[PDB]
Design a protein around this ligand. Structure first.
Ligand SMILES: Nc1ncnc2c1ncn2[C@@H]1O[C@H](COP(=O)(O)OP(=O)(O)OP(=O)(O)O)[C@@H](O)[C@H]1O
Ligand SMILES: Nc1ncnc2c1ncn2[C@@H]1O[C@H](COP(=O)(O)OP(=O)(O)OP(=O)(O)O)[C@@H](O)[C@H]1O
Ligand SMILES: [Mg+2]
Ligand SMILES: [Mg+2]
Lengths: 384, 394, 50
């Protein structure tokens, strides 16, 4: 039960013999120590006697109150659910430690004295923003990039899995990572691969839903966001499409662009607060890297800037090989004709043509996908 | 040789820990109680002694007294108001008007005065705790450090050299420059060195939903500032809390301006904060209102510019001292290669140049590793660079 | 028929709303107009049934 942290001898050596046999000595002494209590203590039982005595102190109508201050000599001002508030005292089975301003407590029904504290069932927004399971397959699903993969493992994964290199180097990891390029080139996809890979708690928020309809609710949402991200452990915060805070204007926003601006001010703090930040990693992505404020883009707030180019054809054929792997491909087709059909197709375009061609197969109930499926498929996808 | 013999005799005593730690009583993991072996002295006495003689004593708020007689006027949260009385255990001195007092439920009379309401979201931005940034780490801007530091701490550490000379030291100071120049990092050294209440304020936190709601946070802030002996108030990114009054037609951005005006009135006009020192920090100072720019509020106007050469070399000595390097490199060449750069950028060159040594297999970085850092961070990331339209502060 | 004039003198019964149960045969119940209460159960009611 969290008895001792020194576990380092690791082998059949004798620090373990003397030390594990030392707590073993004090557990023979502990067992025969407590053995005299059940041997020669018939006065009270104390396993439930004094427990039932506490349960006879506290009444059955256990009211739930709220903390707003603390005075140390076991009395404080607590608020009832009505709003009228008291100056009750605090019991001695209330282990004054989980008492913060705003905490849910248990009061008496009669004199409303502080009986116990209450575990919080938590805000649903944490479960809203928390990614639970692994999204999809690994980095082998990606293909073609092979350089920025080393960059992202370099900035995120290798600091996590090997915290030896940076200490023999005498260095800290690079802080901020941003992603940019043309749309549909794998920016979200690589983040799915990282969410597959890591063991840190992973958070994802769309940049569009940063904006609000009430005044200051944006920056309050940012503050409680980084509260949530900090209060866990070594985590990863992902933000997609942060240009959308600057591009579009919506009529739900009661403030103008001079509320969006203040939201960017509070975020601009929360990347680079004077406070000790902690073990929080930030991964950002957009396709309009030129629109936003470069004060958010400076090194110190974002260190590594990673461009995603359009696929060259050699890489394209690899992507065809990926998205046509487990499908019953008829031999009629030639992928090299399908490569140069569009000069600047994205990685999403290939998967769109493959899936839509499979839909053309399931129109005719067949099992293999033929050439004219691709011939009308590129007409369906590309041209409209 | 005793492979299982240390295994099972290890394991039955590691289990036999728990097999009598259930006989202790640590179990029945709670919903908010406490361990059984603790409060065991409020077991028969305070169970009948902090409960059965001890009351509830509901807390209230005073409206006013009246002359010649006690005959106080009470006020409570939702219910009505009464004519109330002292106890014998209190003097009629400290029952001043506008005060919270503890009041029994039956006779409705006053037992103890209370501290006033603080609105603990203001209490959240009391720092309680200090960072670790040393003035050693703020190299390159020594005269800015000195000209700041004589305003910040010298009256607080020595309130006699100003009295015996017969001057009142200045009370307000703002800090401004391009981003990443060491402004916030410079404030962390002040919060490191000082001792009084360091109450930070980030300006975007004051944007509230209701009308005039932020102004009450300003008022409570300066009230609990007045409660202390000496206090330091820190401000950050005050462009959000106000640029200037410009209004026309449909009244826009008014709610910010009322908060900024309340900040003006709390800074000057009718009884000065006294022993309260403020400290602002912005990116662009051009937008700020001139009545806020008036001295008596913003007496010191410390510039943060780019380091000339030697401040840069000193910053290389700061961010480069604690990493395994080739011994016979020079930093002066690198500071020749960085004309216009921040300490953040210099730090990123250092922390990147270590990663170049981490690329293949080495342990100590080289001069050409530094050269691989310079063209990347300066000249490959030179497309954005964030600095030039902030040099003109627009 | 005679018993009811005695039995109807009894006070009423409150309606509540279980949020979720916890340890040792207790639940967390919040009445619409009032606040949340930690109460126990009666012996004829099962926790999984709650
Ligand atoms: N290099 C690639 N290899 C395989 N598939 C790819 C590649 N690039 C993109 N894709 C496919 O394109 C789809 C869209 O990917 P993703 O959304 O990550 O691109 P994006 O640039 O993030 O798009 P957006 O710009 O809309 O955010 C993915 O499901 C992925 O399967
Ligand atoms: N003189 C300096 N010595 C050492 N490091 C510096 C110096 N100036 C800046 N830095 C580095 O730059 C980073 C940014 O510091 P700081 O947050 O104070 O920037 P700033 O001037 O407040 O601009 P911003 O408002 O954008 O943060 C710090 O992490 C620090 O490491
Ligand atoms: Mg995408
Ligand atoms: Mg700063």
């Amino acid at each position: 039960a969290s008895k001792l942290p020194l576990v380092t001898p690791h082998t059949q050596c004798r620090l373990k013999l003397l030390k594990l046999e030392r707590i073993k000595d004090y557990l023979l002494m502990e067992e025969e120590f407590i053995r005299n209590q059940e041997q020669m203590k018939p006065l009270e039982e104390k396993q439930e006697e004094e427990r039932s005595k506490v349960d006879d102190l506290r009444g059955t109508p256990m009211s739930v109150g709220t903390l707003e201050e603390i005075i140390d000599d076991n009395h404080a001002i607590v608020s009832t659910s009505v709003g009228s508030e008291h100056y009750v005292s605090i019991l001695s089975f209330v282990d004054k430690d989980l008492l913060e301003p705003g905490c849910s407590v248990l009061l008496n029904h009669k004199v409303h004295a502080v009986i116990g504290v209450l575990m919080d069932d938590t805000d649903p927004l944490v479960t809203v923003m928390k990614v639970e399971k692994a999204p999809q397959e690994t980095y082998a699903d990606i293909g073609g990039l092979d350089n920025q993969i080393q960059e992202i493992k370099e900035s995120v994964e290798l600091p996590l899995t090997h915290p030896e290199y940076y200490e023999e180097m005498g260095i800290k990891p690079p802080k901020g990572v941003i992603l940019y390029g043309p749309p549909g080139t794998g920016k979200t996809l690589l983040a799915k691969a990282v969410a597959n890979q890591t063991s840190a708690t992973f958070l994802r928020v769309v940049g569009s839903e940063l904006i609000q309809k009430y005044l200051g609710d944006g920056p309050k949402l940012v503050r409680e966001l980084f509260r949530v991200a900090e209060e866990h452990a070594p985590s990863i915060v992902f933000i997609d499409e942060i240009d959308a805070i600057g591009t579009k204007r919506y009529d739900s926003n009661s403030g103008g662009e001079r509320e969006i601006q203040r939201t960017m001010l509070e975020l601009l703090n929360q990347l680079d607060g004077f406070d000790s930040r902690g073990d929080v990693k930030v991964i950002m992505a957009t396709n309009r890297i030129e629109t936003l404020d470069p004060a958010l883009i400076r090194p110190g707030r974002i260190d590594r800037k990673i461009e995603f180019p359009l696929p060259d054809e050699k890489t394209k054929k690899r992507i065809f090989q990926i998205h046509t792997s487990r499908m019953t491909l008829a031999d009629d087709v030639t992928l090299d004709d399908l490569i140069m059909a569009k000069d600047d197709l994205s990685g999403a375009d290939i998967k769109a043509i493959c899936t839509e061609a499979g839909l053309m197969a399931l129109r005719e109930r067949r099992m293999k996908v033929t050439n004219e499926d691709f011939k009308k498929s590129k007409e369906n996808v590309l041209y409209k | 040789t005793y492979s299982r013999q240390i295994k099972q005799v290890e394991d039955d005593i590691q289990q036999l820990l728990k097999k009598i730690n259930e006989l202790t009583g640590i179990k029945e993991s709670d919903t908010g109680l406490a361990p059984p072996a603790l409060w065991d002295l409020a077991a028969d006495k305070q169970t009948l002694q902090s409960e059965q003689p001890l009351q509830v004593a509901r807390c209230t708020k005073i409206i006013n007294a009246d002359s010649e007689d006690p005959k106080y006027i009470i006020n409570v949260k939702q219910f009505a108001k009464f004519v109330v009385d002292l106890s014998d255990q209190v003097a009629p001195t400290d029952i001043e008007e506008g005060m919270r007092v503890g009041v029994d439920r039956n006779k409705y009379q006053i037992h103890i005065p209370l501290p006033p309401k603080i609105d603990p979201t203001v209490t959240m931005m009391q720092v309680e705790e200090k960072p670790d940034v040393t003035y050693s780490d703020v190299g390159g801007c020594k005269e800015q450090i000195e000209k700041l530091r004589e305003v910040v701490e010298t009256p607080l550490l020595h309130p006699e050299r100003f009295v015996n000379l017969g001057i009142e030291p200045p009370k307000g100071v703002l800090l401004f420059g391009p981003p990443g120049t060491g402004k916030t990092l410079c404030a962390r050294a002040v919060a490191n060195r000082t001792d009084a209440c360091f109450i930070r304020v980030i300006g975007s936190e004051l944007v509230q939903k209701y009308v005039g709601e932020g102004a009450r946070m300003v008022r409570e802030l300066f009230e609990m500032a007045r409660t202390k002996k000496a206090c330091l108030i820190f401000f950050d990114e005050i462009d959000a809390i106000g640029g200037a009054r410009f209004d026309d037609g449909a009244g826009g951005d008014n709610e910010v301006q009322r908060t900024m005006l309340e900040l003006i009135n709390q800074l000057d006009g009718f009884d000065p904060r006294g022993n309260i020192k403020v400290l602002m920090a912005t990116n662009r100072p051009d937008t700020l209102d001139p009545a806020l720019m008036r001295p008596g509020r913003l007496d010191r106007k410390i510039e943060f510019s780019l380091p000339d050469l030697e401040g840069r070399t000193h910053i290389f000595k700061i961010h480069a001292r604690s990493m395994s390097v080739e011994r016979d490199i020079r930093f002066e060449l690198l500071a020749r290669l960085c004309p216009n750069s921040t300490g953040a950028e210099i730090r990123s060159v250092c922390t990147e140049a270590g990663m170049f040594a981490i690329r293949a297999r080495r342990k100590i970085a080289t001069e050409k590793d530094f050269l691989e850092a310079v063209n990347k961070v300066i000249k490959s990331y030179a497309k954005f660079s964030a600095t030039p339209r902030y040099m003109t502060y627009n | 028929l005679r018993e009811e004039l005695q039995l109807l003198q009894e006070q009423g019964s409150y309606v509540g709303e279980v949020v979720r149960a916890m340890d040792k045969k207790k639940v967390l119940v919040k009445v619409h107009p009032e606040g949340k209460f930690v109460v126990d159960v009666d012996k004829n009611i099962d926790i999984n049934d709650v």
